[PDB]
Structure formats: structure tokens, C-alpha cells
């Protein structure tokens, strides 16, 4: 007598949907699991018509190949959830159901936010289209880069290095993600000198420059104190670690950003703790839809070339999920439900770390124009030449695409040619004597 | 004479005890999953535990699904802990025989 | 060679220490892993030797093949003061994505005393809290209403009153109840406030309800917390994890400023702390909540599930001032708190009355025994049953009785004085296994 | 599945049951040498067999020779019959389980044909 | 029976330390002085384990050359002191002990602030290195 498993229920459009994958313990039948998961996340107690509030588990299927793994689909009434509150959404869905003694492992795979609920969130403070008009950057991805090292570098000097980069032809620069306010680099100082670099480099290049200032702080009070002061300096962009800081603190910051027209970069520190394992946790695909909802203009989607296949398809999927307005359900790219966004603006995926210049044509063919290609560390001539190299390589790539060339099959040449014009680009390319495997012939 | 039927009975006993342990697992797994059924099962089981094989027979007549389930659990617990018991009951008694003889030697 | 693996470095007291458990990928030497984990979490004109995080001991977890414990030392300068957020970001941020590791799990962290001194911690904590609630000499009773929504705040309010008047100390907001279309938060607050005021007057005992301030924005959370303060409420609750550490650290300072006790609910914790091979163990998170701020924290039930050995450990960690390293209980490094106050562990979910004497003997007077649902006679007699059961146990202990081998009798005896306790015990005809004698 | 716990219990229960069986061995052997003590031990141990160490603690308080004798008997029993145990339990459980499923399958088809 | 003079106590790192130099009045022994100074600055009243809070005078030596002048070393539990508050530190150390009728003169010479306490203060708003860059 289990009213939490309804195999015939066709979901309403206004429902919230969730796809879990689970390994049931020896003995537990799959329908017992999906129902318990449904009950716990919703009502769960076991004269009214409660039916409205009870979350229903409406479909169960075994994962192709994998033995002892099932997908469980659950529908949630629009009334279960507080507005604008991802926090509440999370607490409702991932709050408890992960601890079940009758479950070996549970992983949340995707969520269908109903348009009716999406409408109650602010979303990105600006989003792709607005931000291009704000920065005046069009027709190409955006170039950023990270400064190494972390601390052990004075404000005056960090700032100097930031200037060297931006002046060398890069759009953005970023604080190391564990840089907040330590015994030898208090934020107020980092902010002063970074601001100075932007203003100078910007005037010198005649191009809009920005550095993501890490306002991530201990308290909401402190976090605001910094954003407030980054505003005072006329900075166009700040960064925030949405996961380690938390979703409440973020929702707050993302609104403030819209009010002060400050762009909001989002670093996913500590994501790997949750999203790494195939069998347990939450997938980054979900956290990304969440980060879209709470708020933010950029978001680190990780690179697609260091990591291999299956990240590829899954990453392409959720890049689409944070960029577009309507996303067709496609299981092969890891998209479980069709997602709409009702004209909620898109988030710029940020391809971060482990990537150097050679990757450039690939990155452009994969991510296209609406991306941020970060480049942290290192060119044999310094920051500026390194920046120039990366910049020319990019400019060369875009035009080669627009001319109509195959960035996979021709990536090599498109760079080698451009290199005959930028000695900085030459030095960099020549730094990587690349390896190719041919089998023995004759 | 002794050891042959001493071990024979002990096997039948262990069989019955794991069934109880399979029951208490299915109890807890249902404790979160289906309180109603968990409540029913617990009350029905009370006292019965004595004989493990008689118990499944009794449970089969009431709710066959639950009888089957316990059967798969007891089978899983046996296969996964059986090999390790001899290296524990022996070294558990040997640790208890050296410790209690220390108490006698002083007082 | 690597300067991030220093096998001879003895940690300075002022260091921050971290214990990781990892499986390296086929081929990857352990020392390389421990060193990369060290390097990435810390740093990488090189008088940098101050700021580098050093990996100073690696060992194989007994039994488990391809399992290693890596100890890393961090300098007191790496971390922003009073920031649990930055602590995490510096420790967990990135080390978990390494392609050279199959899995990484953070077991323990020694917060040095110099860093601990830069955190408020609990806005009150055990000692103080009792002086405020006037409750002494026994663990405190609470219980969870069921179900969540489908109850008009007037009724939730009536249900709460039934429980507090029945002889309980606290009642709790179902953790996924913030403000939904059919139970807007301010209404819940009003009717809960009124339930406390009535029931407290009639009993002559301080009554409480953990009002759930957890909200979308910080702005909103404070609006709730302090309107709750307006009502004269003694305690509010917060989902520190799903809300976020920053958002909490905030609330906890507010709580000390306004003298409001803080009940911390550990929602979402299973997503991180469940798996042996990967994630952060709860003992770490527990320390971070103590550090951020909170007067109560759900340490989970003990009597269900190893769980025990590891639970008692971090209960010690959130209660005591000095905690000796003892690996067998999960305590990786000795921990001082330098007079930072302790957090009351909360035993939640699954427990009915029979568990009572166990729960008393395991946890002692400094704990909250939460009893979420159901007694055949209603909320009030349920609350009375559970109170008598407890009073009976505290006295049985004080007289010198063995709560394990006597628990049965202690309850059956006091069971003959409360008919409400009698009917509660009747509900669970116990199962004991005897082997075929004769 | 909390096998660490399920192992330590079966160990303590088996140990408590090998204490009971050690009592049976000394009782039948002392039944030919001491009828008064064969009844004395039977009276003292009546209903106290359910715990191995709660039984030994009380027998050390009475006759220390009788307590040490059981200790060496239960020492011998486990060192002898324990090696064959696991093979018997599993195959025993699997023989029974397979047979009970057949009986369930025979009761399944008897309700299938009458439908 | 004086528990405020402990010649064997080795200070913990988290302790606050203070070195006084004093001239004891005719008759007063040096150990009576150092102990009183320790008691007054700390608890001083004369079922608990108070031991934590009692400030201990742990070493006494006569000033080389100068007659009738001694150095008195006293240790203070980290718990005696409010954070960021030099005011409180002062009031605790120099508040009263200077008025003793049994003392001709008292001079506070040095204090060891423990790292654990130092960490609770903001310190210079910028300090040497920052200010040069500024």
C-alpha cells in the first residue's frame, strides 16, 4: 500500500522534477527505494486531501549496462518550494534522502525547474548578451588569465603583474580562489592596486579591462563591505566562491550586483567534493542550473580537453544548459529533462586551468564565441608577451573560423602561420615540441 | 561422537541466528522506508526468532515477499562474514581465557 | 624532487593540520600524491618556504589495500581569521579533482589554538545555555512535529502547544519548511510564539521551539531571525550546510549579540560525509560548525548502526576543551579549544522510548534527545511518556544502576506510574533471540 | 549491511553458545562421577546460559575449579570445530534457501493454475 | 601555604608572561611579594578547580649589582584576558599591584604576549611594508 510510487502519473508542467540514480542494498526492490526517496524529500510522515503535497515517484528504469543501478524520476508540486530560494530547493531535494540505510549509494543527476518556478528567481545579474554590451566585447570569446603564485606577493607587485597581463592584450585577470584577506595581503590593499592596474592598462590599450576581485568573505556583512568598496573603485567585475560561501550568501550577492550593475564571476571551489564520483553525490550539471538561478554572469565549467570523453558530452550538455533558453532532453549528452528558462539570461561558461595556447583552435570550435578562456601559467618571456601570444592566437583562430576552416584538422597550421607574425606566439608554440604516434610502415 | 553433532547443531544455530540478523537488517531498512510495514513486521516477529527455518515458513504464510527478502539477506550476510568467524571465536575465547586467568591469579 | 613532501618536518603548534585518505591511481606513488595535495591546497624571490604547505607523514590504512593516510601541515598565515569559508576553500577547494587520485576523503583537521582564538564559536554553548533555560542535571527533551505542510500555522501552533505542555523542553520546525505558499513564515512564528507563551506559563518551565530562519538571502534570514527575536523566542534553527558557512557565521554573531540560542540542523550532510572512500567526514564539518557558531548540532542518532566508535569521538570534539588523539575513536590529532564553549549534540530521528536508557548512558546530561514521531494517545501523552521515561533514567543512573543490563526494568517499573508511558511501551513487543536449550 | 557489527555479534553469541555447550560436556562427564554436583550445576546454571561472560563471572564466585574447567573446554571446542563452520553455514543456508524457493515456486504454480 | 608562588611551573606557550622589578619593604621576603603581585593581578581572593585562572609567579632573581631589587616573573592563563582589548590587559596587569604597602617600588619591565592572544588584535592599520607601497 504505497502511494509514493505512481507509475502512471503524467507530470504537470508546473511540477519540479528530479532524476536520481541509486544502488539498492541486497533485498530492497527498486520501487521501495524510489518511493522512500520521494516520501522523504516531500511529506514523508506516511481529514484532508494531502495528495497535492505528496511528491510522486513516477518512473523507474535500470541504467543500461551497469548492474544494480537504477534511475528514479520524482515529481514535486510547485507548492513545496519557497521562491528565489535555491537553498530551500536543495534542503528539500538533497536534504535527507542521501542517508538511507536501504541504499548503497545515491547520485542526483538532473532537475527540471518548471518555468513557473524559474520566474521567481532573479538569475544572472546581467548574463551573456548584456555583458557584451557592457564591456563592448563582441565576435570572439573572452580572454582571461590567472596569476601565479598565490600569496608571498605584495599588493604593489600582484597589481604590477595584473597590469602586465591586461596591458598585453587580455580582457580579464583573477584572484587565486583561496585569496580573501590573509596576514600578508589584506583585501583593501589588493583592491587598491588592482584598480590602478585596470585604469592604467585600460587607458593604455583603449580596451575595457577587468580583474575578478574575490569578495568571498567570512560573514555577509564582510562580503558586502568588499563588494561595496570594489564598486567605489568603479570595478566592472567581482568573483565569488558560491559553494564554500554557500547559496544564501550568493543569492544576496547576485541581487546586489544587479542593483549596482557589477558583473559577477563565479568560481566553483570545492565542487569536486560533491560532483566527482559517478555513484554518489550531486552532478555539477545540477549545481550549474542552481548557480544560474541564484545568480552569476560567469561560471567555471572546467576545460574539455585535459579531461577526456564522456565529460565531453556531459559538459557540452550543461554548457548548453546554462547558456540557452530552451534545451531539448538528450540523454546522450546527459540532459535528462527538457529545460526552459523563460528568457532568463545565460551564464558564460569559463574554461579553466591546465590549458595552454595549442588548445586554442579546439577551445573555439567547442565553446564558440560565448565563453571565457582562462589562462593561468608559463610563457618564457613574462606576462605581457604571454598575454599577447594568447591574444593573437585567439584572433587568428576566430578569423580562421569565419573564413571557414576546420579548426580540428587545421588547428596546427592556423597557429603556425599566425606565429610567423607574433614572435611571442612563436616562443610559446616552440615551447611544446608535440608528440604524434605513427605505426611502422614498409 | 561429540564434535560431529556439536558442530552439526552449532551450524543449525548459526543458520537461525543470521536469519534473526537478516530480520533486524530488514527491520532497520524498513524503519526508514516503510514505517507501517516495519511496525507490522516487528510485532509479528516478537518471540518467533527461536528457530530460523521455522520462522521463514511462518512468514511465508503471512507476507511472502518479506519472507523471500530475508532469505536473500541471510544468504548475503553468510557469504560475506562466514570465512572470518573461525579467526574470531577462537581468538575471542583465547583472549577471554588469558584475561580471566589473570583475575584468578591475583585474587 | 619535491619540496612539498618533507618527511622530517615536525609541525609547529601554530600550524593547521589535515588528515586525508586517498587511493592513488595505478602507477602514482603515494609521496607524489601527498605532495600535490599539499602543493595545490597551499601555494604552487623565493623565500616562500614560510607559506608552503608541507606533507609530513604518509601511512597505509591497515587492512585496506591501496589506501593511504596523508598528513599535511599548513602555516597560520594561509587562512583568513574567523573565516570557516576560507579555511575550506584553502583545504577542500581543488585537491579533490586530481586525475592521479581515484578518490580523496578529508578525515580530520587540527585547528591550532591561535586560529581558534579568532572565531566566536557558539553564541552561548552548553554551560551558558543551561543557566539561561534553567534546565540542569538531565539531557534536554525535544521532538519533531509530523507532517510538514498541510497544516495551517494555527494547527501547527496547536500541535506544538500539545507537546510543550506534555512536558517537553523543545519542538522543531521540519527542516524543509522556510516559507512555502501554504505556510508563510511569519504566521508560523506568531502561532509558535503563542504556543510557547501559553505552555510555559502553565508548566512553569522554560519552553522553546527551533524557529527555522533559513532563507534565500542573508537580508531575508535576518528579517526572520530578528522578528523571532521580537517575539521573545529563546531559540532559532539554521541549516548551516545548504544555506552556507558565510550566511551562518553571520547569524551566529547576531545570536550572541541578541542572546538567542542557535539550533543547527545538518541538512544535506549525507551528500558529503556518507562514503568512506570520498568526501569530507562529519567530524570535520562538526568542528567547523563549532568554529562558525552554534549552540546545538544534530550529531545524528547513535543506536541505529563503527557508527558508535566514530560518533562518540566527535561528540567529544564538539563538547570538550581538550581532546586527546585516539585513532580508534576517529580522533586523528589532539585538539584544544582554548575555552571556546561546547555545542550540545542532538540525537535525532528513528528513536522511540525503549532507546531512552541507552541514550542517557551514551550521551549524558549534556545532549538533546529529539523525538520525531507515534504515540497512540496524541502529542501530549507522548510527550509525558518520554519525559517520565527520561526522569526515571536520570534517577536510575544517579542511584547507581546499569542502564544497559537494567534499562528494561527501569522503564517497566516507572511504566507502572505513567499510564501514558505504559501504552507507549506496549506498542513495541520486544524481540530477543534465545538458542534452543534442553 | 553493517557487517563490522554483524560479525562482532555473531562472535559474542557463538562464544556465549560455546560456553553453554562446554557446560553440557562437563555435565555429562561429571554425571558419572558426581550425581549431587550434576544436579547442583544444573540448578545453578538454570536460565543463566544466555551470556558467556555473565555466566563465568558468577561461577568464579562459587567454584574457581569449575570456572577454569569450562574455560579450557570452551578453549578446546573452538580450536577444534571452528575451522569447518563457515563451509557448513553457507552451504546449509544455500541448500535451505534454494529448497524454500522451490517450495515457494510450487506454491506459486498451485495458485497460478487455480486462478 | 602559598599557591601563588610556584618555582617549578614551566609556562605554557599560550600563557601571558610579565617581568616586574621591585624593592621589597624591610621585612618582606621576595617570594611573599611576587606571589601577592601574582594573586592581585589575577584572582586574588585566596568546589572547583580554580587552578586554571590563578596566575602563577614562576621565577624570582635579584638584579645584578642593585641591592634590594628583584625580578619577578609571572604567568597568566590565556583566559584571563578579553580579546583585542589592551585596556583589559593593562587593567589586569597594572590595575592594582602597584599600590602594595609591602612594596617600596614596582616597575613593569616586559610582557610576553602569546601568539594565541596576539592573533586577536588588528595591530597596525598597514605597517612598514604596506605603507612603503602606499
Amino acid at each position: 500500500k504505497l502511494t509514493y510510487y505512481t507509475p502512471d502519473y503524467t507530470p504537470k508542467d508546473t511540477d519540479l522534477l528530479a532524476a536520481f540514480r541509486f544502488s539498492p542494498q541486497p533485498g530492497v526492490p527498486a520501487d521501495e527505494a524510489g518511493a522512500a526517496i520521494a516520501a522523504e524529500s516531500s511529506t514523508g510522515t506516511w481529514l484532508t486531501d494531502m495528495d497535492r503535497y505528496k511528491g510522486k515517484c513516477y518512473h523507474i528504469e535500470p541504467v543500461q549496462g551497469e548492474e544494480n543501478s537504477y534511475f528514479a524520476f520524482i515529481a514535486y508540486p510547485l507548492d513545496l518550494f519557497e521562491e528565489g530560494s535555491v537553498t530551500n530547493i536543495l534542503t528539500s531535494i538533497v536534504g535527507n534522502v542521501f542517508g538511507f540505510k536501504a541504499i548503497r549509494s545515491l547520485r542526483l543527476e538532473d532537475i527540471r525547474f518548471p518555468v513557473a518556478l524559474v520566474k521567481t528567481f532573479q538569475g544572472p545579474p546581467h548574463g551573456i548578451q548584456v555583458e557584451r554590451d557592457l564591456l563592448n566585447k563582441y565576435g570572439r570569446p573572452m580572454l582571461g588569465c590567472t596569476i601565479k603564485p598565490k600569496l608571498g606577493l605584495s599588493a604593489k607587485n600582484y597589481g604590477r603583474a595584473v597590469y602586465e597581463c591586461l596591458r598585453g592584450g587580455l580582457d580579464f585577470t583573477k584572484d587565486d580562489e583561496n585569496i580573501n584577506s590573509q596576514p600578508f595581503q589584506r583585501w583593501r590593499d589588493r583592491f587598491l592596486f588592482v584598480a590602478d592596474a585596470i585604469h592604467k592598462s585600460q587607458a593604455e590599450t583603449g580596451e575595457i579591462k577587468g580583474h575578478y576581485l574575490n569578495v568571498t568573505a567570512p560573514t555577509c556583512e564582510e562580503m558586502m563591505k568588499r563588494a561595496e568598496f570594489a564598486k567605489e573603485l568603479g570595478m566592472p567585475i567581482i568573483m565569488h566562491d558560491f559553494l564554500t560561501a554557500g547559496f544564501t550568501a550568493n543569492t544576496t550577492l547576485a541581487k546586489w550586483c544587479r542593483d549596482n550593475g557589477v558583473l559577477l564571476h563565479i568560481h566553483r571551489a570545492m565542487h569536486a567534493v560533491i560532483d566527482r564520483q559517478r555513484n554518489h553525490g550531486i552532478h555539477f550539471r545540477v549545481l550549474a542550473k542552481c548557480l544560474r538561478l541564484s545568480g552569476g554572469d560567469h561560471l567555471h565549467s572546467g576545460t574539455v580537453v585535459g579531461k577526456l570523453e564522456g565529460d565531453k558530452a556531459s559538459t557540452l550538455g550543461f554548457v548548453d544548459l546554462m547558456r540557452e533558453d530552451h534545451i531539448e532532453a538528450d540523454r546522450s549528452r546527459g540532459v535528462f529533462f527538457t529545460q526552459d528558462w523563460a528568457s532568463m539570461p545565460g551564464v558564460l561558461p569559463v574554461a579553466s586551468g591546465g590549458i595552454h595556447v595549442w588548445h586554442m583552435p579546439a577551445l573555439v570550435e567547442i565553446f564558440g564565441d560565448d565563453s571565457v578562456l582562462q589562462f593561468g601559467g608559463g610563457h618564457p618571456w613574462g606576462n605581457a608577451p604571454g598575454a599577447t601570444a594568447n591574444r593573437v592566437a585567439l584572433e587568428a583562430c576566430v578569423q580562421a573560423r569565419n573564413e571557414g576552416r576546420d579548426l580540428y584538422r587545421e588547428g596546427g597550421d592556423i597557429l603556425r602561420e599566425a606565429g610567423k607574425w607574433s614572435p611571442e606566439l612563436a616562443a610559446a608554440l616552440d615551447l611544446w615540441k608535440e608528440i604524434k604516434f605513427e605505426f611502422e610502415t614498409m | 561422537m561429540n564434535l560431529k553433532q556439536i558442530a552439526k547443531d552449532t551450524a543449525k544455530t548459526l543458520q537461525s541466528y543470521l536469519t534473526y540478523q537478516a530480520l533486524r537488517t530488514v527491520l532497520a531498512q524498513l524503519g526508514e522506508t516503510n514505517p507501517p510495514l516495519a511496525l507490522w513486521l516487528h510485532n509479528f516477529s516478537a518471540g518467533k526468532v527461536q528457530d530460523g527455518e521455522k520462522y521463514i515458513e511462518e512468514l511465508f504464510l503471512e507476507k511472502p515477499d518479506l519472507a523471500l527478502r530475508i532469505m536473500t539477506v541471510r544468504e548475503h550476510i553468510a557469504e560475506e562474514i562466514a570465512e572470518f568467524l573461525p579467526e574470531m571465536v577462537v581468538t575471542g575465547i583465547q583472549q577471554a581465557n588469558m584475561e580471566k586467568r589473570r583475575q584468578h591469579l591475583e585474587r
Side-chain angles (χ1 to χ4, degrees), chain A residues 375-395:
Chain A
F375 285 94
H379 188 281
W381 288 351
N383 302 286
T388 303
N390 288 226
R391 178 60 188 282
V392 171
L394 183 72
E395 292 292 335

Side-chain angles (χ1 to χ4, degrees), chain A residues 40-42 50 52-53 79-85 87-88 90-92 94-96 98-100 103-105 150-152 177-184 186 216-221 226 241 244-249 251-252 255 267 269-274 276-277 280-282:
Chain A
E40 262 298 318
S41 50
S42 71
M50 284 303 293
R52 170 140 52 143
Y53 306 121
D79 305 346
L80 272 214
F81 314 92
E82 178 184 48
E83 297 83 345
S85 193
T87 302
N88 182 251
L90 286 145
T91 324
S92 300
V94 297
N96 284 18
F98 280 75
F100 277 143
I103 289 296
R104 298 178 150 278
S105 29
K150 172 209 43 75
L151 218 87
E177 94 289 347
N178 45 10
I179 291 297
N180 277 176
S181 197
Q182 280 88 323
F184 274 109
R186 256 83 230 220
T216 308
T219 59
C220 312
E221 298 93 317
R226 306 176 191 186
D241 280 312
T244 37
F247 258 110
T248 301
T251 312
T252 295
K255 316 262 255 102
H267 190 291
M270 176 195 165
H271 77 93
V273 186
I274 303 153
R276 188 105 197 273
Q277 304 301 330
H280 195 86
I282 311 168

Side-chain angles (χ1 to χ4, degrees), chain A residues 182-203:
Chain A
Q182 280 88 323
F184 274 109
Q185 215 213 67
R186 256 83 230 220
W187 67 277
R188 179 63 157 62
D189 298 345
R190 176 171 91 261
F191 281 46
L192 264 205
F193 284 89
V194 155
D196 174 55
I198 279 149
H199 296 131
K200 286 173 176 185
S201 84
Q202 179 149 152

Side-chain angles (χ1 to χ4, degrees), chain B residues 5-7 9-11 13-44 46-53 55-61 63-82 84-86 88-94 96-97 101 104-105:
Chain B
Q5 196 121 341
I6 280 175
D9 290 25
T10 305
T13 324
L14 271 213
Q15 273 223 224
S16 299
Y17 182 76
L18 298 184
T19 319
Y20 160 71
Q21 287 286 282
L23 170 59
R24 283 216 304 176
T25 309
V26 170
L27 222 81
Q29 295 197 333
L30 258 77
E32 311 166 323
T33 304
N34 196 311
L37 201 58
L39 169 61
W40 177 83
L41 179 66
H42 184 274
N43 274 346
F44 169 89
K48 266 83 164 180
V49 275
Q50 186 62 71
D51 182 325
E53 300 306 319
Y55 173 85
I56 316 283
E57 285 168 347
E58 282 203 358
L59 184 54
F60 249 115
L61 290 172
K63 287 192 190 195
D65 287 22
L66 277 61
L68 279 160
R69 216 233 234 191
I70 281 167
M71 282 170 60
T72 329
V73 181
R74 90 218 285 261
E75 194 173 22
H76 183 76
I77 307 170
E79 290 170 2
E80 297 285 71
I81 75 160
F84 306 94
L85 301 158
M88 283 175 66
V89 181
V90 179
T91 41
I93 288 169
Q94 284 171 323
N97 284 347
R101 240 158 266 158
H104 177 89
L105 210 77

Side-chain angles (χ1 to χ4, degrees), chain A residues 212-277 279-289:
Chain A
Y212 331 114
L213 293 151
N214 201 182
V215 289
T216 308
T219 59
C220 312
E221 298 93 317
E222 259 298 317
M223 172 203 71
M224 281 308 175
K225 180 165 263 197
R226 306 176 191 186
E228 271 304 341
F229 180 76
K231 220 277 183 225
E232 202 179 307
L233 295 178
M235 299 285 88
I237 197 153
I238 51 147
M239 85 167 264
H240 189 224
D241 280 312
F242 83 119
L243 282 167
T244 37
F247 258 110
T248 301
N250 194 80
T251 312
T252 295
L253 188 79
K255 316 262 255 102
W256 175 88
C257 279
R258 152 88 105 270
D259 278 320
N260 297 270
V262 177
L263 292 183
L264 181 70
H265 186 95
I266 295 293
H267 190 291
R268 27 95 109 150
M270 176 195 165
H271 77 93
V273 186
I274 303 153
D275 86 20
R276 188 105 197 273
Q277 304 301 330
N279 69 342
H280 195 86
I282 311 168
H283 189 234
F284 192 81
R285 166 172 45 244
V286 176
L287 321 181
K289 295 169 102 158

